[model samples]
Target: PKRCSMVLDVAFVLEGSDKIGEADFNRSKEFMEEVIQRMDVGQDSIHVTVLQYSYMVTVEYPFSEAQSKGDILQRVREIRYQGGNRTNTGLALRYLSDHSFLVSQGAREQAPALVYMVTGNPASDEIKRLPGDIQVVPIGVGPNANVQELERIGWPNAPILIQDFETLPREAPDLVLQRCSSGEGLE
Candidate 1:
């Protein structure tokens, strides 16, 4: 079976803190590597950006930072964990909506904006609802993630929750990609 290209801009907002176990952290990194392999990542197909957060959010790479899938994969592997006090998903959301996906950040008006947030704690700050143009997919890992908080962000789709972070890389990459390519969230 064959189809043409499906283009979109993919961004990841990952939570980093003392709470996230080392094994789980590595699994998240491995999951990203596997996910990009299944994506047609490039300047033309899919633009990739990464953000890591604890008390603050740091851009591992902007959308334009990596030109090829190989570079994207390398960047993902090199992502440094920022251990701090808070989960602060709300702050990360504010940063993304305000600054992450702008033209300067290599966001394309023609392509749909897709965000996957990996989080495992209650928000330490207020999460503002994003504009309708961007589609957000929240992945909640562990009990601390609080399904209500993820829902409170007001994304169009239901969040995917995992009891064990160990299972994240198993079938999880497919789950996120499935939602991304489903083309259902745009209104």
Candidate 2:
């Protein structure tokens, strides 16, 4: 049989601090709903996982949780904003590196793995080096977002700086799609 499938395993790491506000959180959900709606969902297409973090981490949904587009959207809608005072972006990344992204967790060894990290604050020095196989696409959200920090987190020239949550719905999908088809994702 001819090889025809391009499977992508994507992880959405979102900031869920109280500083992000209700409107922004809702917009984030909306943006993800839009993104997942456009992506082809199947074992051979795209599999999405979600993580929300503040001082702690919450695994909102795993890649194996949703096999279809509608199921993903429904889970997105159900995600509640977990408002905490601190943005522990570094801890969150470490958690993902340690506990998630495994074959048992629906991460295929040969697929192009992507981590799209959306945050409004700078990461701590505790930020651990990510797995070499996982490509990062950092997104800075809201007025106080640290764009430079996001840039540092992403692969070279792969950060998307959005001024507000409202812009994310419009800007993020295209950026994600473009990156998913270029550079490291092309394999």
Candidate 3:
């Protein structure tokens, strides 16, 4: 390698709720799949973790367990729709801070995390801010996903609000370029 070490830790947290309807849920899955396709996922380079949350949170793949991109795609395609009635975004965010990004779970301290949250409905509870090392990028799925809350949840970086789940995949190319700051990720 010409340069020094380079690693990016990413988290894709999908909001699971029947409130968004089965149609929207399927479309969101499509969006997530497309996003992953654009990333350089692997154990060495860009490590990604996918988690689904509603009232409860479930892990699809911890960064350490993601050995291959094929497996990640397969899991995303086959992800079960628990379809919970509630949308507790606060709980999901808290969990990501408390456990998901722990070093033992494969999160690296030296490398800051790029947390991508795919949200349907807004949070019913308070949206707590994340730690310094983690940069959150909230992607709003539909109209029901409030922009104000998302922007606040994301903080610093504006929320990437797609018109609807159907068009979410098409906007992947632009959304993929979203970084923690404007000038930083240029290279």
Candidate 4:
């Protein structure tokens, strides 16, 4: 008999923080690792991808193989947030959910899927809703982030974890995971 494997398909949608002179590259790095750590997920069983957004959305990492926890950390540290004009979060989600990057299973069972977004500013007005079954975790970088609007995009008023710019990276995964554990089924 052969054993079955399970892997969670997760996507992270990050909004670049635009300040006069503050770059969010470091924050993005810290946040990514933190989110992964908090999820406490076994890397071998988790497949992850990242989309970075500012004036536009860039796919930093596509769905890839994760041999272990260390791979995720190593790759996450390499991501840097380039400052830009605005946050195009809606477009990012729409692309992920409706394009070539559809989430599906290979040999493993499709565990659960999650989408985590962190922003220091506001989302674009053009987006009305997000992809279905996406667990969205948002950390308001500052006062400008529209926490309410982000929550509205989630199904059933989706689970949200709010954190300050200084501490968002560390706290976000925990909140998201708590929601996942509680039956939100958010990977």
Candidate 5:
């Protein structure tokens, strides 16, 4: 007889320069919501985390508690931008790689662990080293982004997905489903 796989644990990591204006960040937040809705991933199964970067890096929802649609929208909508010209993507990657909320023991054959990042700019001359085992899907949005730099942080199995400001929300959810379904079981 064959064994069964457990549910997968994943995290949606949102990263970008806070200097991009309130509207852009809010748009990113909307993209996040769309990702949840499109993937139809349960709040319990898929944990969403956000890293807003600029002059510094801050975790908006570091493995947040399961939240309703209204609560999430409300919380994200309230964010104000005070950004600089840097994109500390490596730091964001390190945070997720080192401190993911879930453990690999519970990972199923079908579902493994993954991290996603939404960025608007390139590196700030500080980011180095990418996460391992975990899958990272970097969604590059807007004009000033560095595609090459983002590409270096991802594994060959999963290439980075870049989205323009207009198509970001619509396309992001699909990428989430694709990566999660393809993750390798850790245990």
Candidate 6:
């Protein structure tokens, strides 16, 4: 089938540090590739932005950076782990909320927006104040991740936990698509 014509602005906020192993990071990258492949990536379909956070926040790219699927996939693969002592997830969220989703970054007021947050640490209470229109899907990775904390960050919807990271390749993309799409589906 042709790719769906849904308009969505998706942001991926990943916690990167020495704590999250290389193997786990690679697995998440592979999962991200799968998710991007499934999306209708283009100027009018789905626009994506990515941020990797540790002691500092790195914007791998903003939503307006890639205009096609291949470009988006290439960007995802090129994402690297920034080794730092801490995971400041709250700071990352605040950055995205305040700056990343603006019109300059390709966000459309009419399109549905979603933030897929993957982290191995508990977020600060600041997460409770995130903007209401965006649907935040929290994915906790590895054994160190606190499930209860993830649930609290994404309260209404139970966060998805990946003990193996391996399961993400099989599960995450579909769930993300479903949550971002319109009632008639991605089309």
- For each candidate, what TM-score against the reference? 0.92, 0.88, 0.88, 0.76, 0.72, 0.86
Please give, for residues 90-183, the per-residue lDDT of candidate 4 as tens digits: 7777766664146442213455665666666656647756555655655456666676776676555453544565566655555655554564
- TM-score of decoy 6: 0.86
Error of 1 at 9 (Å): 0.6
Residue 65 local lDDT, model 1: 77
Over 4 Å off in model 6, which ranges? 1-5, 124-128, 182-187
Runs in model 2 lying further than 4 Å from the true structure: 1-5, 183-187
Q: What residue pairs clash in candidate 6, if any at all?
A: none
lDDT of 3 by residue, 1-187 (tens): 0111237787888887888767777777887777666666666766778888887888888876754678889988888877888888998898789988899988877876778888878787787878867778888877788889888877765677778787877874455544532313224
Which residue pairs in candidate 5 have backbone atoms (N, alpha carbon, C) closer than 3 angstroms, thus clashing? none
For model 1, the superposed segments whose C-alpha errors exceed 4 Å read 1-5, 185-187
Tens digits of per-residue lDDT, candidate 6, 1-187, equal 2233588888888777677767777777787788778777888788888888878889887876757888877888888877777778878878787888888776788977778888877653355467766667888877778787677667555677776677877777676667555422222
Worst 10 residues of 1 by lDDT: 1-10
lDDT per residue (tens digit) for residues 1-187 in model 5: 1121225455565554655666777677787766555443444454445556666666665544444445545556665565556666666666666665444422333546566677777766666565466776667677777877767766554344555666777666565555555552212
Candidate 2, residue 153: the lDDT equals 67
Candidate 6, residue 115: lDDT: 81
Residue 64 CA displacement from its true place in model 4, Å: 3.2
lDDT per residue as tens, model 2, 46-94: 8888899987999888865757777777888889998888888888888
> What order do candidates take by TM-score, descending?
1, 2, 3, 6, 4, 5
